[PDB]
CSV table of C-alpha atoms and ligand atoms in Angstrom, one decimal:
chain,number,residue,atom,x,y,z
A,1410,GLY,CA,-10.0,13.7,19.6
A,1411,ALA,CA,-10.2,11.8,16.3
A,1412,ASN,CA,-12.9,11.9,13.6
A,1413,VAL,CA,-13.6,8.1,13.3
A,1414,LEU,CA,-15.8,6.7,10.4
A,1415,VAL,CA,-17.1,3.2,11.4
A,1416,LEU,CA,-18.5,0.8,8.7
A,1417,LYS,CA,-20.3,-2.3,9.8
A,1418,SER,CA,-21.1,-4.8,7.0
A,1419,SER,CA,-22.0,-8.1,8.8
A,1420,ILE,CA,-25.5,-9.7,8.2
A,1421,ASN,CA,-25.5,-11.0,11.8
A,1422,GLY,CA,-26.6,-7.6,13.4
A,1423,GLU,CA,-26.0,-7.2,17.2
A,1424,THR,CA,-24.7,-10.9,17.3
A,1425,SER,CA,-21.9,-10.1,14.7
A,1426,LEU,CA,-18.4,-10.9,15.9
A,1427,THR,CA,-16.9,-8.1,13.6
A,1428,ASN,CA,-19.4,-5.6,15.1
A,1429,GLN,CA,-18.5,-6.8,18.7
A,1430,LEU,CA,-14.7,-6.5,18.0
A,1431,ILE,CA,-15.2,-3.0,16.4
A,1432,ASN,CA,-17.1,-1.9,19.6
A,1433,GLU,CA,-14.3,-3.4,21.7
A,1434,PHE,CA,-11.6,-1.6,19.6
A,1435,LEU,CA,-13.5,1.8,20.0
A,1436,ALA,CA,-13.9,1.1,23.8
A,1437,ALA,CA,-10.1,0.3,24.0
A,1438,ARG,CA,-9.3,3.6,22.2
A,1439,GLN,CA,-11.6,5.5,24.7
A,1440,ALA,CA,-9.7,3.7,27.6
A,1441,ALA,CA,-6.4,4.9,26.1
A,1442,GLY,CA,-7.6,8.5,26.2
A,1443,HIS,CA,-8.9,9.1,22.6
A,1444,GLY,CA,-12.1,11.1,22.8
A,1445,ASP,CA,-13.4,10.0,19.4
A,1446,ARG,CA,-16.2,11.7,17.4
A,1447,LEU,CA,-17.9,8.6,15.7
A,1448,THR,CA,-19.8,8.6,12.4
A,1449,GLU,CA,-21.2,5.0,12.2
A,1450,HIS,CA,-23.0,3.2,9.3
A,1451,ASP,CA,-24.6,-0.2,9.6
A,1452,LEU,CA,-24.1,-0.7,5.8
A,1453,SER,CA,-26.3,-3.9,6.1
A,1454,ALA,CA,-29.3,-1.8,7.0
A,1455,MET,CA,-28.7,1.0,4.4
A,1456,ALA,CA,-29.9,-0.7,1.2
A,1457,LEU,CA,-27.1,1.0,-0.7
A,1458,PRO,CA,-27.6,1.2,-4.5
A,1459,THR,CA,-25.7,-1.2,-6.7
A,1460,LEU,CA,-23.4,0.4,-9.3
A,1461,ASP,CA,-25.2,0.1,-12.7
A,1462,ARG,CA,-24.8,1.7,-16.1
A,1463,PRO,CA,-26.8,5.0,-15.5
A,1464,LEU,CA,-25.3,5.5,-12.0
A,1465,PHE,CA,-21.8,5.0,-13.4
A,1466,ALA,CA,-22.5,7.6,-16.1
A,1467,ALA,CA,-23.9,10.1,-13.5
A,1468,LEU,CA,-20.9,9.6,-11.1
A,1469,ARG,CA,-18.5,10.5,-14.0
A,1470,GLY,CA,-20.5,13.7,-14.7
A,1471,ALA,CA,-23.4,12.8,-17.0
A,1472,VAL,CA,-26.6,14.8,-16.1
A,1473,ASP,CA,-29.2,12.1,-15.3
A,1474,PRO,CA,-32.6,13.7,-14.5
A,1475,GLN,CA,-33.9,10.3,-13.0
A,1476,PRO,CA,-34.6,11.0,-9.3
A,1477,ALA,CA,-33.2,7.6,-7.9
A,1478,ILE,CA,-29.9,8.3,-9.8
A,1479,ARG,CA,-29.8,12.0,-8.5
A,1480,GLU,CA,-30.1,10.9,-4.9
A,1481,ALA,CA,-27.6,7.9,-5.3
A,1482,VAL,CA,-25.2,10.6,-6.6
A,1483,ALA,CA,-26.0,12.8,-3.5
A,1484,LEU,CA,-25.5,9.7,-1.3
A,1485,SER,CA,-22.0,9.1,-3.0
A,1486,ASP,CA,-21.1,12.7,-2.4
A,1487,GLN,CA,-22.1,12.4,1.3
A,1488,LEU,CA,-20.1,9.1,1.9
A,1489,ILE,CA,-17.0,10.6,0.2
A,1490,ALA,CA,-17.3,13.8,2.3
A,1491,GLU,CA,-17.4,11.6,5.5
A,1492,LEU,CA,-14.4,9.6,4.3
A,1493,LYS,CA,-12.3,12.8,3.6
A,1494,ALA,CA,-13.3,14.4,7.0
A,1495,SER,CA,-12.2,11.3,9.0
A,1496,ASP,CA,-8.7,10.6,10.6
A,1497,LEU,CA,-9.4,6.9,11.2
A,1498,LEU,CA,-11.6,4.5,9.1
A,1499,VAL,CA,-12.7,1.3,11.0
A,1500,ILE,CA,-14.1,-1.4,8.7
A,1501,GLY,CA,-16.0,-4.6,9.6
A,1502,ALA,CA,-15.0,-7.1,6.8
A,1503,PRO,CA,-15.8,-10.7,7.9
A,1504,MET,CA,-15.1,-13.2,5.1
A,1505,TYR,CA,-18.3,-14.2,3.3
A,1506,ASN,CA,-17.7,-16.7,0.4
A,1507,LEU,CA,-13.9,-15.7,0.0
A,1508,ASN,CA,-14.9,-12.0,-0.3
A,1509,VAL,CA,-16.1,-9.1,1.9
A,1510,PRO,CA,-19.9,-8.8,2.5
A,1511,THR,CA,-21.7,-7.3,-0.4
A,1512,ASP,CA,-22.8,-4.1,1.5
A,1513,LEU,CA,-19.1,-3.2,2.2
A,1514,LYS,CA,-18.3,-3.6,-1.5
A,1515,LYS,CA,-21.3,-1.4,-2.4
A,1516,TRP,CA,-19.8,1.4,-0.1
A,1517,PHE,CA,-16.5,1.1,-2.0
A,1518,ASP,CA,-18.3,1.3,-5.4
A,1519,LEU,CA,-19.9,4.6,-4.2
A,1520,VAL,CA,-16.7,6.2,-2.7
A,1521,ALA,CA,-14.0,5.0,-5.2
A,1522,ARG,CA,-14.7,7.7,-7.8
A,1523,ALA,CA,-12.2,9.2,-10.3
A,1524,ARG,CA,-11.4,12.9,-9.4
A,1525,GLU,CA,-13.1,12.5,-6.0
A,1526,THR,CA,-11.0,9.9,-4.0
A,1527,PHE,CA,-8.3,9.1,-6.7
A,1528,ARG,CA,-7.0,10.0,-10.1
A,1529,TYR,CA,-6.0,7.3,-12.6
A,1530,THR,CA,-5.4,9.5,-15.7
A,1531,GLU,CA,-2.3,11.5,-14.5
A,1532,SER,CA,1.4,10.7,-15.2
A,1533,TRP,CA,1.5,8.8,-11.8
A,1534,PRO,CA,-1.1,7.1,-9.6
A,1535,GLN,CA,-2.7,9.7,-7.1
A,1536,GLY,CA,-5.0,9.1,-4.1
A,1537,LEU,CA,-7.1,12.1,-2.9
A,1538,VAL,CA,-7.8,10.9,0.6
A,1539,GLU,CA,-5.1,12.4,2.9
A,1540,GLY,CA,-4.4,11.9,6.6
A,1541,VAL,CA,-6.6,8.9,6.9
A,1542,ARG,CA,-5.5,5.5,8.3
A,1543,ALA,CA,-7.6,2.3,8.5
A,1544,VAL,CA,-8.2,-0.6,10.9
A,1545,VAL,CA,-10.0,-3.6,9.4
A,1546,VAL,CA,-11.7,-6.2,11.7
A,1547,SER,CA,-11.9,-9.4,9.7
A,1548,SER,CA,-13.1,-12.7,11.2
A,1549,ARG,CA,-13.2,-16.0,9.3
A,1550,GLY,CA,-14.7,-19.5,10.1
A,1551,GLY,CA,-11.6,-21.2,8.6
A,1552,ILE,CA,-7.8,-20.2,8.6
A,1553,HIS,CA,-6.6,-18.0,5.7
A,1554,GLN,CA,-4.1,-15.4,7.1
A,1555,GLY,CA,-1.1,-15.4,4.7
A,1556,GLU,CA,-2.7,-18.2,2.5
A,1557,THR,CA,-3.8,-17.8,-1.2
A,1558,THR,CA,-7.5,-18.2,0.0
A,1559,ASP,CA,-7.3,-14.7,1.7
A,1560,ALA,CA,-8.3,-12.3,-1.2
A,1561,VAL,CA,-10.0,-10.0,1.4
A,1562,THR,CA,-6.7,-8.7,2.8
A,1563,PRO,CA,-5.1,-7.8,-0.6
A,1564,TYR,CA,-8.5,-6.5,-1.9
A,1565,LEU,CA,-8.8,-4.0,1.1
A,1566,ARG,CA,-5.1,-3.0,0.9
A,1567,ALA,CA,-5.5,-2.3,-2.8
A,1568,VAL,CA,-8.9,-0.4,-2.8
A,1569,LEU,CA,-7.9,1.6,0.3
A,1570,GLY,CA,-4.4,2.3,-1.3
A,1571,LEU,CA,-6.1,3.4,-4.6
A,1572,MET,CA,-7.7,6.3,-2.6
A,1573,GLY,CA,-4.4,7.1,-0.8
A,1574,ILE,CA,-5.0,5.2,2.5
A,1575,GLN,CA,-1.6,3.5,2.7
A,1576,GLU,CA,-1.6,2.7,6.5
A,1577,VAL,CA,-4.0,-0.3,7.0
A,1578,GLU,CA,-3.8,-2.5,10.1
A,1579,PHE,CA,-5.9,-5.8,10.4
A,1580,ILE,CA,-7.5,-7.4,13.5
A,1581,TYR,CA,-8.0,-11.0,12.5
A,1582,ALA,CA,-10.1,-13.6,14.3
A,1583,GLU,CA,-9.7,-17.0,12.5
A,1584,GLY,CA,-10.7,-20.6,12.9
A,1585,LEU,CA,-14.0,-19.6,14.5
A,1586,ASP,CA,-15.8,-22.6,13.0
A,1587,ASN,CA,-13.8,-24.8,15.6
A,1588,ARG,CA,-16.2,-24.2,18.6
A,1589,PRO,CA,-15.7,-23.6,21.4
A,1590,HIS,CA,-11.9,-23.5,21.7
A,1591,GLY,CA,-10.9,-22.4,18.1
A,1592,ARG,CA,-13.4,-19.5,18.4
A,1593,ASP,CA,-12.0,-18.6,21.9
A,1594,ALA,CA,-8.4,-18.8,20.6
A,1595,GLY,CA,-9.3,-16.5,17.6
A,1596,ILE,CA,-11.1,-13.9,19.8
A,1597,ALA,CA,-8.2,-13.9,22.3
A,1598,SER,CA,-5.7,-13.3,19.4
A,1599,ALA,CA,-8.0,-10.4,18.1
A,1600,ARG,CA,-8.2,-8.9,21.6
A,1601,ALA,CA,-4.3,-8.9,22.0
A,1602,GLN,CA,-4.1,-7.1,18.6
A,1603,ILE,CA,-6.9,-4.6,19.8
A,1604,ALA,CA,-4.8,-3.9,23.0
A,1605,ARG,CA,-1.6,-3.2,20.8
A,1606,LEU,CA,-3.6,-1.0,18.3
A,1607,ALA,CA,-5.6,1.1,20.8
A,1608,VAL,CA,-2.9,3.4,22.1
A,1609,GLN,CA,-1.8,5.0,18.7
A,1610,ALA,CA,-3.5,8.3,17.7
B,355,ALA,CA,-20.3,-29.1,-24.1
B,356,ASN,CA,-23.0,-27.6,-21.8
B,357,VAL,CA,-21.6,-24.0,-21.3
B,358,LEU,CA,-22.9,-21.7,-18.6
B,359,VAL,CA,-22.1,-18.1,-19.5
B,360,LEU,CA,-22.2,-15.3,-16.8
B,361,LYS,CA,-21.9,-11.6,-17.9
B,362,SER,CA,-21.5,-9.1,-15.1
B,363,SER,CA,-20.3,-5.9,-16.8
B,364,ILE,CA,-22.3,-2.7,-16.3
B,365,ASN,CA,-21.2,-1.3,-19.8
B,366,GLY,CA,-24.0,-2.9,-21.8
B,367,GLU,CA,-23.2,-3.1,-25.6
B,368,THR,CA,-19.8,-1.4,-25.0
B,369,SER,CA,-18.7,-4.1,-22.5
B,370,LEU,CA,-15.2,-5.4,-23.4
B,371,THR,CA,-15.6,-8.6,-21.3
B,372,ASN,CA,-19.0,-9.3,-23.0
B,373,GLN,CA,-17.4,-8.8,-26.4
B,374,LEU,CA,-14.4,-11.0,-25.5
B,375,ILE,CA,-16.8,-13.7,-24.1
B,376,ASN,CA,-18.7,-13.7,-27.4
B,377,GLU,CA,-15.4,-13.9,-29.3
B,378,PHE,CA,-14.3,-16.9,-27.1
B,379,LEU,CA,-17.6,-18.8,-27.7
B,380,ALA,CA,-17.4,-18.0,-31.4
B,381,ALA,CA,-13.7,-19.2,-31.5
B,382,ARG,CA,-15.0,-22.5,-29.9
B,383,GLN,CA,-17.7,-22.9,-32.6
B,384,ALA,CA,-15.0,-22.2,-35.3
B,385,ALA,CA,-12.8,-24.9,-33.8
B,386,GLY,CA,-15.8,-27.4,-34.2
B,387,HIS,CA,-17.2,-27.5,-30.6
B,388,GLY,CA,-21.0,-27.7,-30.8
B,389,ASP,CA,-21.7,-25.9,-27.5
B,390,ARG,CA,-25.1,-25.7,-25.9
B,391,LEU,CA,-25.2,-22.3,-24.2
B,392,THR,CA,-27.1,-21.1,-21.1
B,393,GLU,CA,-26.4,-17.3,-20.8
B,394,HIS,CA,-27.2,-14.9,-17.9
B,395,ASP,CA,-26.6,-11.2,-18.1
B,396,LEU,CA,-26.3,-10.9,-14.3
B,397,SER,CA,-26.4,-7.0,-14.6
B,398,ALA,CA,-30.1,-7.3,-15.9
B,399,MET,CA,-31.3,-9.9,-13.4
B,400,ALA,CA,-31.6,-7.8,-10.2
B,401,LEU,CA,-30.2,-10.6,-8.0
B,402,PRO,CA,-31.0,-10.2,-4.3
B,403,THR,CA,-28.2,-9.2,-1.8
B,404,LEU,CA,-27.4,-11.9,0.7
B,405,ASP,CA,-29.0,-10.8,4.0
B,406,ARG,CA,-29.8,-12.5,7.3
B,407,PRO,CA,-33.2,-14.0,6.3
B,408,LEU,CA,-32.0,-15.3,2.9
B,409,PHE,CA,-28.8,-16.8,4.5
B,410,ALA,CA,-30.9,-18.5,7.2
B,411,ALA,CA,-33.2,-20.0,4.4
B,412,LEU,CA,-30.2,-21.1,2.1
B,413,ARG,CA,-28.4,-22.8,5.0
B,414,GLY,CA,-31.7,-24.7,5.8
B,415,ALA,CA,-31.8,-23.2,9.4
B,416,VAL,CA,-35.5,-22.1,8.8
B,417,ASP,CA,-38.2,-22.6,6.2
B,418,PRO,CA,-38.3,-19.8,3.6
B,419,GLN,CA,-41.1,-17.3,4.5
B,420,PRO,CA,-43.2,-16.0,1.5
B,421,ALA,CA,-41.1,-12.9,0.4
B,422,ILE,CA,-37.8,-15.1,0.3
B,423,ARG,CA,-39.3,-18.2,-1.5
B,424,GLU,CA,-38.5,-16.7,-4.9
B,425,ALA,CA,-34.8,-16.0,-3.9
B,426,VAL,CA,-34.4,-19.6,-2.6
B,427,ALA,CA,-35.9,-21.0,-5.9
B,428,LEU,CA,-33.5,-18.7,-7.8
B,429,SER,CA,-30.5,-20.1,-5.8
B,430,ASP,CA,-31.7,-23.7,-6.5
B,431,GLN,CA,-32.1,-22.8,-10.3
B,432,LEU,CA,-28.6,-21.2,-10.5
B,433,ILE,CA,-27.0,-24.2,-8.7
B,434,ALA,CA,-28.8,-26.8,-11.0
B,435,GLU,CA,-27.5,-24.8,-14.0
B,436,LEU,CA,-24.0,-24.9,-12.6
B,437,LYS,CA,-24.0,-28.7,-11.8
B,438,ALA,CA,-25.5,-29.4,-15.3
B,439,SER,CA,-22.6,-27.5,-17.1
B,440,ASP,CA,-19.2,-28.8,-18.3
B,441,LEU,CA,-17.7,-25.3,-18.9
B,442,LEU,CA,-18.3,-22.1,-16.8
B,443,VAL,CA,-17.4,-18.9,-18.7
B,444,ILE,CA,-17.3,-15.8,-16.4
B,445,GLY,CA,-17.1,-12.1,-17.2
B,446,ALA,CA,-15.1,-10.6,-14.3
B,447,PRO,CA,-13.7,-7.1,-15.2
B,448,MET,CA,-11.9,-5.4,-12.3
B,449,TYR,CA,-14.2,-2.8,-10.7
B,450,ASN,CA,-12.5,-1.1,-7.7
B,451,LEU,CA,-10.0,-4.0,-7.3
B,452,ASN,CA,-12.9,-6.4,-7.0
B,453,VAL,CA,-15.3,-8.2,-9.4
B,454,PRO,CA,-18.6,-6.5,-10.4
B,455,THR,CA,-21.3,-6.6,-7.6
B,456,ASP,CA,-23.7,-8.7,-9.9
B,457,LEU,CA,-21.1,-11.5,-10.2
B,458,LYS,CA,-20.5,-11.5,-6.4
B,459,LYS,CA,-24.3,-11.7,-5.9
B,460,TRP,CA,-24.3,-14.9,-8.1
B,461,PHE,CA,-21.5,-16.4,-6.0
B,462,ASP,CA,-23.5,-15.6,-2.8
B,463,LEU,CA,-26.5,-17.5,-4.2
B,464,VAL,CA,-24.5,-20.6,-5.4
B,465,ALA,CA,-21.7,-21.1,-2.8
B,466,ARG,CA,-24.0,-22.9,-0.3
B,467,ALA,CA,-23.3,-25.7,2.3
B,468,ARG,CA,-24.7,-29.1,1.3
B,469,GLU,CA,-25.4,-27.8,-2.3
B,470,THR,CA,-22.0,-26.9,-3.8
B,471,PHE,CA,-19.7,-27.6,-0.8
B,472,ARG,CA,-19.8,-29.8,2.3
B,473,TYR,CA,-18.3,-29.2,5.8
B,474,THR,CA,-15.7,-31.9,6.8
B,475,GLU,CA,-13.6,-32.1,10.0
B,476,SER,CA,-10.8,-30.1,8.3
B,477,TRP,CA,-11.1,-28.2,5.0
B,478,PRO,CA,-14.5,-27.8,3.2
B,479,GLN,CA,-15.1,-30.2,0.2
B,480,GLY,CA,-16.5,-29.1,-3.2
B,481,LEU,CA,-19.6,-30.9,-4.5
B,482,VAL,CA,-19.6,-29.6,-8.1
B,483,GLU,CA,-17.9,-32.1,-10.5
B,484,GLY,CA,-17.0,-32.2,-14.2
B,485,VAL,CA,-17.0,-28.3,-14.3
B,486,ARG,CA,-14.0,-26.3,-15.6
B,487,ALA,CA,-14.0,-22.4,-15.7
B,488,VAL,CA,-12.7,-19.7,-18.1
B,489,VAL,CA,-12.6,-16.2,-16.7
B,490,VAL,CA,-12.4,-13.1,-18.9
B,491,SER,CA,-11.0,-10.3,-16.8
B,492,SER,CA,-10.2,-6.9,-18.4
B,493,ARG,CA,-8.4,-4.1,-16.4
B,494,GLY,CA,-7.7,-0.4,-17.0
B,495,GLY,CA,-4.3,-0.9,-15.2
B,496,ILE,CA,-1.7,-3.8,-15.2
B,497,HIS,CA,-2.2,-6.2,-12.2
B,498,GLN,CA,-1.4,-9.7,-13.5
B,499,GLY,CA,0.9,-11.5,-11.0
B,500,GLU,CA,0.9,-8.4,-8.7
B,501,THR,CA,-0.5,-8.0,-5.2
B,502,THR,CA,-3.2,-5.5,-6.5
B,503,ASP,CA,-4.9,-8.4,-8.4
B,504,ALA,CA,-7.3,-9.8,-5.7
B,505,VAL,CA,-9.8,-10.7,-8.5
B,506,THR,CA,-7.7,-13.7,-9.6
B,507,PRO,CA,-7.1,-15.3,-6.1
B,508,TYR,CA,-10.8,-14.5,-5.1
B,509,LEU,CA,-12.1,-16.4,-8.2
B,510,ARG,CA,-9.7,-19.3,-7.8
B,511,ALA,CA,-10.7,-19.6,-4.1
B,512,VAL,CA,-14.6,-19.4,-4.4
B,513,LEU,CA,-14.6,-21.7,-7.5
B,514,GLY,CA,-12.1,-24.0,-5.6
B,515,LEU,CA,-14.6,-24.0,-2.6
B,516,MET,CA,-17.3,-25.6,-4.8
B,517,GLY,CA,-14.8,-28.1,-6.4
B,518,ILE,CA,-14.0,-26.1,-9.6
B,519,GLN,CA,-10.2,-26.5,-9.5
B,520,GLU,CA,-9.5,-26.0,-13.3
B,521,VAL,CA,-9.7,-22.2,-13.9
B,522,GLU,CA,-8.1,-20.5,-17.0
B,523,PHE,CA,-8.0,-16.7,-17.2
B,524,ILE,CA,-8.1,-14.4,-20.3
B,525,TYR,CA,-6.5,-11.0,-19.3
B,526,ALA,CA,-6.9,-7.7,-21.2
B,527,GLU,CA,-4.8,-5.2,-19.2
B,528,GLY,CA,-3.4,-1.7,-19.5
B,529,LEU,CA,-6.6,-0.6,-21.3
B,530,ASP,CA,-6.5,2.9,-19.7
B,531,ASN,CA,-3.2,3.6,-21.7
B,532,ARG,CA,-4.8,4.6,-25.1
B,533,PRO,CA,-4.6,4.3,-28.0
B,534,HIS,CA,-1.7,1.7,-27.8
B,535,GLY,CA,-2.5,0.2,-24.4
B,536,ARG,CA,-6.2,-0.7,-25.3
B,537,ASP,CA,-5.2,-2.2,-28.7
B,538,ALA,CA,-2.3,-4.1,-27.1
B,539,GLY,CA,-4.4,-5.6,-24.3
B,540,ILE,CA,-7.2,-6.6,-26.7
B,541,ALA,CA,-4.7,-8.2,-29.1
B,542,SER,CA,-3.1,-10.1,-26.1
B,543,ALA,CA,-6.6,-11.4,-25.1
B,544,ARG,CA,-7.5,-12.5,-28.6
B,545,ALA,CA,-4.2,-14.5,-28.8
B,546,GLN,CA,-5.1,-16.1,-25.4
B,547,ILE,CA,-8.7,-16.8,-26.7
B,548,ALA,CA,-7.3,-18.5,-29.8
B,549,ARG,CA,-4.9,-20.8,-27.7
B,550,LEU,CA,-7.9,-21.7,-25.4
B,551,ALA,CA,-10.7,-22.2,-28.0
B,552,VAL,CA,-8.9,-25.1,-29.8
B,553,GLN,CA,-9.0,-27.2,-26.6
C,3051,FMN,C1,-22.6,-15.9,4.1
C,3051,FMN,C2,-21.3,-16.4,4.9
C,3051,FMN,C3,-20.2,-16.9,4.2
C,3051,FMN,C4,-19.1,-17.3,4.8
C,3051,FMN,N1,-18.0,-17.6,4.1
C,3051,FMN,C5,-16.9,-17.9,4.7
C,3051,FMN,C6,-15.7,-18.3,3.9
C,3051,FMN,O1,-15.7,-18.2,2.7
C,3051,FMN,N2,-14.6,-18.6,4.6
C,3051,FMN,C7,-14.5,-18.6,6.0
C,3051,FMN,O2,-13.5,-18.9,6.5
C,3051,FMN,N3,-15.6,-18.3,6.7
C,3051,FMN,C8,-16.7,-18.0,6.1
C,3051,FMN,N4,-17.8,-17.6,6.9
C,3051,FMN,C9,-17.7,-17.5,8.4
C,3051,FMN,C10,-17.4,-16.1,8.8
C,3051,FMN,O3,-16.2,-15.6,8.2
C,3051,FMN,C11,-17.3,-16.0,10.3
C,3051,FMN,O4,-18.4,-16.6,10.9
C,3051,FMN,C12,-17.3,-14.5,10.8
C,3051,FMN,O5,-16.8,-14.5,12.1
C,3051,FMN,C13,-18.6,-13.9,10.7
C,3051,FMN,O6,-18.5,-12.5,11.1
C,3051,FMN,P1,-19.7,-11.7,11.6
C,3051,FMN,O7,-20.3,-12.4,12.9
C,3051,FMN,O8,-19.2,-10.3,11.9
C,3051,FMN,O9,-20.8,-11.7,10.5
C,3051,FMN,C14,-19.0,-17.2,6.3
C,3051,FMN,C15,-20.1,-16.8,7.0
C,3051,FMN,C16,-21.3,-16.3,6.3
C,3051,FMN,C17,-22.4,-15.8,7.1
C,3052,FMN,C1,-16.8,1.0,-12.0
C,3052,FMN,C2,-15.4,0.7,-12.6
C,3052,FMN,C3,-14.3,0.5,-11.8
C,3052,FMN,C4,-13.0,0.2,-12.3
C,3052,FMN,N1,-12.0,-0.1,-11.4
C,3052,FMN,C5,-10.9,-0.5,-11.9
C,3052,FMN,C6,-9.8,-0.9,-11.1
C,3052,FMN,O1,-9.9,-1.0,-9.9
C,3052,FMN,N2,-8.6,-1.3,-11.7
C,3052,FMN,C7,-8.4,-1.3,-13.0
C,3052,FMN,O2,-7.3,-1.7,-13.5
C,3052,FMN,N3,-9.4,-0.9,-13.9
C,3052,FMN,C8,-10.6,-0.5,-13.3
C,3052,FMN,N4,-11.6,-0.2,-14.2
C,3052,FMN,C9,-11.4,-0.4,-15.6
C,3052,FMN,C10,-12.0,-1.7,-16.1
C,3052,FMN,O3,-11.4,-2.8,-15.4
C,3052,FMN,C11,-11.9,-1.9,-17.6
C,3052,FMN,O4,-12.4,-0.7,-18.3
C,3052,FMN,C12,-12.7,-3.1,-18.2
C,3052,FMN,O5,-12.2,-3.3,-19.5
C,3052,FMN,C13,-14.1,-2.9,-18.2
C,3052,FMN,O6,-14.7,-4.1,-18.6
C,3052,FMN,P1,-16.2,-4.1,-19.2
C,3052,FMN,O7,-16.2,-3.1,-20.4
C,3052,FMN,O8,-16.5,-5.5,-19.6
C,3052,FMN,O9,-17.2,-3.6,-18.1
C,3052,FMN,C14,-12.9,0.1,-13.7
C,3052,FMN,C15,-14.0,0.3,-14.5
C,3052,FMN,C16,-15.2,0.6,-14.0
C,3052,FMN,C17,-16.4,0.8,-14.9
C,3053,1IE,C1,-17.4,4.1,-9.2
C,3053,1IE,S1,-17.7,5.5,-10.3
C,3053,1IE,C2,-16.2,5.7,-11.3
C,3053,1IE,C3,-16.0,6.9,-12.0
C,3053,1IE,C4,-14.8,7.0,-12.8
C,3053,1IE,C5,-13.9,6.0,-12.8
C,3053,1IE,C6,-14.1,4.8,-12.1
C,3053,1IE,N1,-13.2,3.7,-12.1
C,3053,1IE,C7,-12.1,3.5,-13.0
C,3053,1IE,C8,-10.9,3.0,-12.5
C,3053,1IE,C9,-10.4,2.8,-11.1
C,3053,1IE,C10,-8.9,2.3,-11.3
C,3053,1IE,C11,-8.5,2.4,-12.8
C,3053,1IE,C12,-9.8,2.8,-13.4
C,3053,1IE,N2,-10.0,2.9,-14.7
C,3053,1IE,C13,-11.2,3.3,-15.2
C,3053,1IE,C14,-11.4,3.3,-16.6
C,3053,1IE,C15,-12.6,3.6,-17.1
C,3053,1IE,C16,-13.7,3.8,-16.3
C,3053,1IE,C17,-13.6,3.9,-15.0
C,3053,1IE,C18,-12.3,3.5,-14.4
C,3053,1IE,C19,-15.3,4.7,-11.3
C,3054,1IE,C1,-24.6,-18.3,0.7
C,3054,1IE,S1,-25.6,-19.4,1.7
C,3054,1IE,C2,-24.4,-20.3,2.7
C,3054,1IE,C3,-24.9,-21.4,3.4
C,3054,1IE,C4,-24.0,-22.1,4.2
C,3054,1IE,C5,-22.7,-21.8,4.3
C,3054,1IE,C6,-22.2,-20.7,3.6
C,3054,1IE,N1,-20.9,-20.3,3.7
C,3054,1IE,C7,-19.9,-20.6,4.7
C,3054,1IE,C8,-18.6,-21.0,4.4
C,3054,1IE,C9,-18.0,-21.2,3.0
C,3054,1IE,C10,-16.5,-21.5,3.3
C,3054,1IE,C11,-16.4,-21.8,4.8
C,3054,1IE,C12,-17.7,-21.3,5.4
C,3054,1IE,N2,-18.0,-21.3,6.6
C,3054,1IE,C13,-19.2,-20.8,7.0
C,3054,1IE,C14,-19.5,-20.7,8.4
C,3054,1IE,C15,-20.7,-20.3,8.9
C,3054,1IE,C16,-21.7,-20.0,8.0
C,3054,1IE,C17,-21.5,-20.1,6.6
C,3054,1IE,C18,-20.2,-20.5,6.1
C,3054,1IE,C19,-23.1,-19.9,2.8
């Protein structure tokens, strides 16, 4: 089977379209014969710490006695270990205010750590996450795919690429603010992309 | 001018974007602009993360319940400050190919339907007028004009949403290449600051 790490960042809980389409993508993989081993985080419910001065110092190797900082460092180590153990990373990244949801960005700020998931100080750029590919589910109220207003796509390609995750496929559901038919059209397009992506290992 | 200054670095007194912001504002005073400053260190303000109950209150779908009232009043305050300004100066160093979390948390409190933008039948319409922006963005690597710069299009798009179409950037890049890269990027930013402050 595959070790699949699933990140849900929507604030709309069990009514989330990105969480629905993630669940459909995982069901489609099961139907295509992948017996996945899921590690799932609802980042919206996890109250991840924000990166601040003391946490940044501690993640780079400073010894910080402070107990909140010691367990934010342990949380960073756990999240990085899950990432490196996975074969497939599935990310819910609906567009909120031209960016990803804050809880997804807080996950990246805990896993994107020099000497843990990348190196920036060597003669050439080096990712340290190997054998991991990503599928991003990104719904939007408006239409943005291939437009200058889509910073989400290049942001996720660049931060995943920093860590060595070069293979990133997107499931887009756009124009969802045009209800009901724009939303139906966008979900139909997403479901056709799910069908095409579900067979690959 | 009424200048709204947002600092988002986590590097405290060693922050390069906070230093370059201070140098930009001082260059304006040297050029004879008598600016009135409103300054927020967003890293010290513990802004709330946008979650379902806050979003419901900010969109006006529900009255704010007691524990959220403060966050709604903060949103209204930050938006009033923005609409009262002529010039918005933003510290946005690149952290993990994005802006710092505290800057994003500011945008999630001010980018608000019926307050800074309005739904139309096609594209959303900005409600903030008379505001131009200057963004100070330092980077360890070199990203300007490259597909790895998502910070620049993100900021142009969320500022553009609210009606802020005039956005100038001050870049200090290649700072992880020391000693020459850091000195070279800061000298480039200072030359950009001097060109901008005289306007
Ligand atoms: C806080 C917030 C901000 C949003 N900002 C944008 C935006 O900048 N552009 C856009 O096209 N849609 C925007 N939308 C619409 C969402 O992208 C769209 O509804 C999406 O399908 C929501 O996904 P979810 O149900 O998984 O949360 C926003 C929605 C929310 C809740
Ligand atoms: C948490 C963190 C993450 C960073 N990520 C990046 C990165 O993605 N790309 C880059 O070129 N530099 C990166 N850097 C380097 C900063 O962009 C650079 O040091 C900048 O000048 C810091 O600005 P400041 O001192 O105002 O906080 C990062 C630095 C920090 C502290
Ligand atoms: C989230 S903890 C952490 C620990 C160590 C490093 C980083 N990020 C950095 C970069 C990522 C791309 C280029 C970078 N250049 C840097 C220069 C100075 C300080 C940090 C970084 C983050
Ligand atoms: C941070 S409070 C807030 C209140 C109201 C609206 C928003 N943002 C939205 C957009 C901004 C660009 C296009 C958008 N489409 C949306 C569709 C549904 C719900 C919200 C939005 C945010």
